[PDB]
RNA sequence: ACCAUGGUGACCACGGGUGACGGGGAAUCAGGGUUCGAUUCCGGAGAGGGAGCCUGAGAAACGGCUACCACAUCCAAGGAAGGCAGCAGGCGCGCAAAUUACCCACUCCCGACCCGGGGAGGUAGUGACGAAAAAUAACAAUACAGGACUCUUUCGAGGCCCUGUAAUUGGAAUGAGUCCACUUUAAAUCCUUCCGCGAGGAUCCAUUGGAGGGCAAGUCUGGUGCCAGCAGCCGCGGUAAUUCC
């Protein structure tokens, strides 16, 4: 119903909690300024798509 | 013994202080910082004097090795060297017995002699045996 | 029209010194009664104890019950309200605690849609409120 | 009360607005080309390039045969010739305003040790500075943003303590040798 | 004391408020300004609140005295002792602020004085108030994908450049850590010099926020169903949410 003062913490305490699974550690610092500069400017790929953004699906 | 250079620069004597003071740098290829007990004789075998007047200190070493540098001096007389010299640099190599009570206890003895007034034997023995 | 001449600056400096009162910011920061009006009194954070969890419904285009508490400060202990800006965190706070309150964000006015709120909740019982929200401290013994 | 210095100012400054695409990405192709650690040391050198052009805009509205133009201007002009950004004969007050930010990232130690071929792969030329190898004439320096001058531009080589300049190897040879004469002769 | 009846004022006196010590300055910056400056420099004021004095060249002194007010100690009940807005520390107010550490060796000061004193001052410990530098792998060999480089050709990969998957290794690479020895200092520790150590999921492992718009980045999957919530604003949410978890 209208949720007067009960169910504070209704949607967090019922949504499924998935284990944050481990990955490669991310390269930081000067390496992060290396590994994304190569992804954006030196590899201007001849593919089309009207400048498809970096987080595509 | 093998490869150490002891240059000097900016030497000025003064018979005011009766000392012979200069800047010393110590250039070594790849070894450690050589101690004073190896350097204060290397002027003694070059200024031909006794190494109980040569006082070296202040050796601060650059970034990257090679030249460390510092200050040094030579008194004229060991009799002079114990007159016009402060006792801290004079006792870095053994020439003086400096260990009294730590000052925080000597402060409290002076204020305790101050609260027992006038009696001379209780301005000495104001609690020597009660310890 | 305006009053110009090379001897007039008394007229300009006396016409100015009342006409600066009529905006909000010079009147709320220099008359002094708006320094008594906020419960903080020259501050940004001031502790207080929790009286009762009391909920308010949000304003017109929404419909939800925003959750609030009923803090009473220790310095100049007048009653306020305080919003707990978090999902489950009405259950992390409990009765008769000590909390910290801050501003709600835009200088003594409510943000979003809570009708008549002025303060938000940080650090219940000297442990951080978001650190109970992630799992970085627990409530003491 | 104290005898401390107290005089410490900031060296960079934040930009005017954030998040505009013709600012950060035209400056992203400088953080990646000359291989710098982060963008804090780009706002450093742009503010370094700014304050010279802050001085240089006063020196253009100062008239000719001016005391404080010719004194300050020549003294400025004899300071950026020796830093290598400006050549000798065409030293002027006018050619300093057309200067760009590229010509102070070139004059670091980190890429003047690359173009002398002492190391390849410009991100590696950061490392062999910081990794205690590469010297100014008698002074080895692990600082990548050393602004190398022009008199002392020819004496960059390996240090005489360096693995690539001397000997006395580190652990990685001495540990690989130890496993061969540790289970055998 | 005797006389004179005057003085100040809308050019803002008088009265009150000041969360006002005054200044040199700080932030800010087209120019005009705006706001703070309790604070390390100089000038003033006050050592619980008012008041009164002795001695001194110098005091209305409080690490001098006595009175009153208020707070407060010892006590055998007779009387004593007081005053941290000095340095360390406590309590209390508080969103809210350093160790009951070492030394006079350094900058100076006083004296009867080359000799003594110094919580002045310096050395440390806390310190993500802050400011200045700067780690968190680069190098590689296939290898995965592109290259104006190739045959008299969109023959096909490649004698050559950059990148990621994903390797196998490596060696005159290396610090932080562990720890000698010098060194610094009053004796130390710092930090620099230097042995010895010290890195294959370099496990010695980067966090704070955001992803509709302002505004750089997801209409990817799930849960939810105007509930929970998000959001500085505009908004989003009511069974397929690019905004909540």
């Amino acid at each position: 119903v209208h949720g007067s003062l009960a169910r504070a913490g209704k949607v967090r305490g019922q949504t499924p909690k998935v284990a944050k699974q481990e990955k490669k550690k991310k390269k930081t610092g000067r390496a992060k300024r290396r590994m994304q500069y190569n992804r954006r400017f030196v590899n201007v790929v001849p593919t089309f798509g009207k400048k498809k953004g970096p987080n595509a699906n | 013994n093998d490869t150490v250079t002891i240059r000097t620069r900016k030497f000025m004597t003064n018979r005011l202080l009766q000392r012979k003071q200069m800047v010393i740098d110590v250039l070594h290829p790849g070894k450690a910082t050589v101690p004073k007990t190896e350097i204060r004789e290397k002027l003694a075998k070059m200024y031909k004097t006794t190494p109980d007047v040569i006082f070296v200190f202040g050796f601060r070493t650059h970034f990257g090795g090679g030249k460390t540098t510092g200050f040094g001096m030579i008194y004229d007389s060991l009799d002079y060297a114990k007159k016009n010299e402060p006792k801290h640099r004079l006792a870095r190599h053994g020439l003086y017995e400096k260990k009294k009570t730590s000052r925080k206890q000597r402060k409290e003895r002076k204020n305790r002699m101050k609260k027992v007034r006038g009696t001379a034997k209780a301005n000495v023995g104001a609690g020597k045996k009660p310890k | 029209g305006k009053c110009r001449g090379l001897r007039t600056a008394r007229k300009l400096r006396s016409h100015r010194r009342d006409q600066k009162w009529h905006d909000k910011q010079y009147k709320k920061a220099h008359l002094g009664t708006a320094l008594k009006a906020n419960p903080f009194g020259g501050a940004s954070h001031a502790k207080g104890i929790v009286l009762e969890k009391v909920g308010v419904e949000a304003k017109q285009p929404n419909s939800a019950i925003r959750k609030c508490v009923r803090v009473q400060l220790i310095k100049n202990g007048k009653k306020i309200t305080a919003f707990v800006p978090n999902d489950g965190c009405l259950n992390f706070i409990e009765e008769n605690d000590e909390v910290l309150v801050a501003g709600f964000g835009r200088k003594g006015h409510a943000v979003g849609d809570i009708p008549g709120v002025r303060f938000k909740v940080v650090k219940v019982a000297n442990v951080s409120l978001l650190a109970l929200y992630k799992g970085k401290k627990e409530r003491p013994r | 009360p104290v005898a401390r210095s107290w005089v410490c100012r900031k060296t960079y400054v934040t930009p005017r607005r954030p998040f505009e695409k013709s600012r950060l990405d035209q400056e992203l192709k400088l953080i990646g080309e000359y291989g710098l650690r982060n963008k804090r040391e780009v706002w450093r050198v742009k503010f370094t390039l700014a304050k010279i052009r802050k001085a240089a805009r006063e020196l253009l509205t100062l008239d000719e045969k001016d005391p404080r133009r010719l004194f300050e201007g020549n003294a400025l002009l004899r300071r950026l010739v020796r830093i290598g950004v400006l050549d000798e004969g065409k030293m002027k007050l006018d050619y300093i305003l057309g200067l760009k930010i590229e010509d102070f990232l070139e004059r670091r130690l980190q890429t003047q040790v690359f173009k002398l071929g002492l190391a390849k792969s410009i991100h590696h030329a950061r490392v062999l500075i910081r990794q205690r190898h590469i010297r100014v004439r008698k002074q080895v320096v692990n600082i990548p943003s050393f602004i190398v001058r022009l008199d002392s531009q020819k004496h960059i080589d390996f240090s005489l303590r360096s693995p690539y300049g001397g000997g006395r190897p580190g652990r990685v040879k001495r540990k690989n040798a130890k496993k061969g004469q540790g289970g055998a002769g």
Side-chain angles (χ1 to χ4, degrees), chain B residues 21-106:
Chain B
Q21 60 188 358
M22 74 289 287
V23 179
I24 298 168
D25 54 352
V26 177
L27 194 152
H28 59 86
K31 275 77 70 178
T33 300
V34 288
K36 295 184 288 184
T37 186
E38 189 66 28
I39 301 302
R40 65 183 172 88
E41 59 89 19
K42 292 180 182 181
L43 280 73
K45 68 181 177 67
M46 293 176 72
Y47 285 96
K48 278 77 69 178
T49 58
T50 63
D52 285 330
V53 298
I54 293 93
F55 295 161
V56 297
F57 61 95
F59 292 95
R60 177 62 67 194
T61 305
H62 292 90
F63 181 75
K67 184 173 76 173
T68 187
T69 184
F71 183 79
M73 50 72 53
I74 301 167
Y75 284 107
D76 289 329
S77 178
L78 181 59
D79 296 333
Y80 295 165
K82 292 181 182 292
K83 295 286 99 175
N84 55 3
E85 178 66 27
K87 299 182 187 294
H88 67 282
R89 289 182 288 115
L90 187 63
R92 293 181 62 84
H93 64 90
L95 291 176
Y96 181 70
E97 182 269 331
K98 179 70 174 178
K99 182 65 177 67
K100 298 286 98 177
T101 62
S102 66
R103 65 189 288 269
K104 190 65 182 293
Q105 292 293 321
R106 185 176 63 246

Side-chain angles (χ1 to χ4, degrees), chain C residues 4-132:
Chain C
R4 59 174 71 90
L6 271 299
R7 73 280 162 275
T8 192
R10 174 177 291 111
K11 172 65 64 61
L12 288 168
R13 198 257 306 277
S14 63
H15 174 74
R16 179 61 55 194
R17 54 92 168 268
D18 65 354
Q19 291 293 321
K20 289 199 290 185
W21 290 101
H22 292 179
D23 58 354
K24 267 86 72 175
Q25 66 274 20
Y26 188 75
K27 189 169 184 177
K28 73 171 286 186
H30 289 88
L31 199 148
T33 56
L35 190 144
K36 292 185 179 295
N38 53 0
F40 290 162
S44 71
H45 292 78
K47 295 189 295 290
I49 68 165
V50 178
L51 269 73
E52 183 68 25
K53 306 177 185 185
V54 56
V56 289
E57 187 175 1
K59 288 167 70 176
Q60 301 305 119
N62 292 314
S63 180
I65 304 296
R66 296 285 185 263
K67 277 81 177 175
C68 295
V69 295
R70 188 56 182 171
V71 188
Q72 188 269 336
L73 310 178
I74 46 168
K75 180 181 72 176
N76 62 19
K78 57 178 72 174
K79 297 294 294 297
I80 60 171
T81 181
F83 182 82
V84 183
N86 217 356
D87 195 1
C89 290
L90 187 63
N91 293 318
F92 292 100
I93 64 101
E94 69 272 19
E95 190 66 30
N96 67 15
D97 291 329
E98 55 86 16
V99 299
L100 187 58
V101 295
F104 202 63
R106 35 92 59 80
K107 299 297 289 187
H109 288 156
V111 322
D113 51 357
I114 305 99
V117 76
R118 298 292 181 267
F119 304 98
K120 76 179 180 71
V121 177
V122 298
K123 284 184 70 69
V124 56
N126 289 319
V127 303
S128 308
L129 185 58
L130 192 144
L132 289 172

Side-chain angles (χ1 to χ4, degrees), chain D residues 24 46 70 79 84 87:
Chain D
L24 79 164
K46 191 171 77 69
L70 292 176
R79 190 171 65 244
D87 52 352

